[PDB]
Amino acid sequence: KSSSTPPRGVTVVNNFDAKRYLGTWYEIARFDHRFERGLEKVTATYSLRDDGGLNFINKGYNPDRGMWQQSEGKAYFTGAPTRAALKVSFFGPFYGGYNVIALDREYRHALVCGPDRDYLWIQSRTPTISDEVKQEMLAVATREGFDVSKFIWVQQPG
Amino acid sequence: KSSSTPPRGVTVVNNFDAKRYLGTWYEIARFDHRFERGLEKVTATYSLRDDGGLNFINKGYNPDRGMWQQSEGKAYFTGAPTRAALKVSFFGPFYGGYNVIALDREYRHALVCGPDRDYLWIQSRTPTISDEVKQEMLAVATREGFDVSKFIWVQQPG
Ligand code: NA
Ligand code: NA
């Protein structure tokens, strides 16, 4: 069976109004899986997308690591929007795809792209790289048609 | 074009050894999207799955909200494991599906399941519910074949 259909024989709510479901919900109880194991004070907050999906933000406190954690995704109705059966997608940095397009012999410096030229990263085993490595990486990116003026260079420790 | 193929005309590394790529990488630079906007001190840590995919954990500091944030997902080769082109899936609480199977007239208390009877939540607009609402929610779950002994009831404020 699909991961985007309900369990066999389980009936879903059939007069759902997503507008009244928006906002914050407290998780009272869960069946445990790896992702939520040990989380406390868990909430989910739903908002309506321009395209008719729901966006959601999940928040919970991890007592082990002593810090708040969060997750973001979207959900789309699989049928009529009055039937509360939805398909879920979680958000993250590397949308759609992860393609290594440059890599040194020693696996120290990588240029990684997504599914089109709007998705590009420079990754390193070290928090800083030499201007020489920056210039080599920017040359490969430019030669393959990425606009390297779009880079946000990330704050890292000295 | 697919979100799980590289940009047109971009060539990927073709003698990739995922074993040498494992462990921690620092994000030196990114093209900005909603998910990473404003994040500092960003890393990704790769590990090998039993099924041949890569697991990854992304970590970054959000200076706005003054706290560390993290994200988890997996990536699978789309072809030969020596061609560094991968499809990405992010992890979260509500795997595969989100199905509302019980809801009161006032949109205050919900029973929500995933794609099989191993996925179940009780959600509330309030951090606590009455034993009456607990018993109503557990009765519906039991009547539809969920093992309500699997619930972890979540710590919430009084
Ligand atoms: Na492109
Ligand atoms: Na089932």
Numbering used by the authors:
A (entry chain A), B (entry chain A): 19 to 176
Copy the relevant paper text.
In our previous work, using a combination of computational and in vitro screenings we created a panel of FAPs from bacterial lipocalin Blc (named DiBs) capable of recovering the fluorescence of synthetic analogs of green and red fluorescent proteins’ chromophores. The lipocalin fold contains a single eight-stranded continuously hydrogen-bonded antiparallel β-barrel complemented by an α-helix. Fluorogen-activating proteins (FAPs) are a group of unrelated proteins capable of binding to non-protein ligands (fluorogens) and increase the fluorescence quantum yield and/or change spectral properties of these ligands. Here we report on DiB-splits, a self-assembling FAP split system which has been inspired by the domain-swapped structure of a full-length DiB protein.
Our attempts to structurally characterize other DiB proteins in apo and bound states resulted in obtaining protein crystals of DiB3 in the apo form at low pH conditions (pH 3.5) which diffracted to 1.6 Å. The asymmetric unit contains only one protein chain. However, it forms a biological assembly (dimer) with a crystallographic symmetry mate. The intertwined dimer is caused by domain swapping: each of the two Blc-like eight-stranded beta-barrel folds is created by the N-terminus of one of two polypeptide chains and the C-terminus of the other. While DiB3 was previously successfully used for in cellulo protein labelling, we proposed that the observed domain swapping was driven mainly by the very low pH conditions of the crystallization buffer rather than the private DiB3 mutations (V74F and L141Q). To further evaluate this assumption, we calculated the interaction energies between N- and C-termini fragments of the wtBlc, DiB1, and DiB3 proteins using Rosetta38. Despite the fact that wtBlc protein seems to be slightly more stable, DiB3 is not an outlier, suggesting that the introduced mutations are unlikely to cause the domain swapping. Independent from the reason that caused domain swapping in the crystal, we reasoned that the DiB3 protein as well as other mutants might have two relatively autonomous and stable parts (residues 1 to 108 and 114 to 177). In our case, however, the obtained DiB3 structure is pointing to a potential cleavage site. In this study, inspired by the obtained domain-swapped crystal structure of the DiB3 protein in its apo state, we designed and characterized a novel DiB-split FAP system.
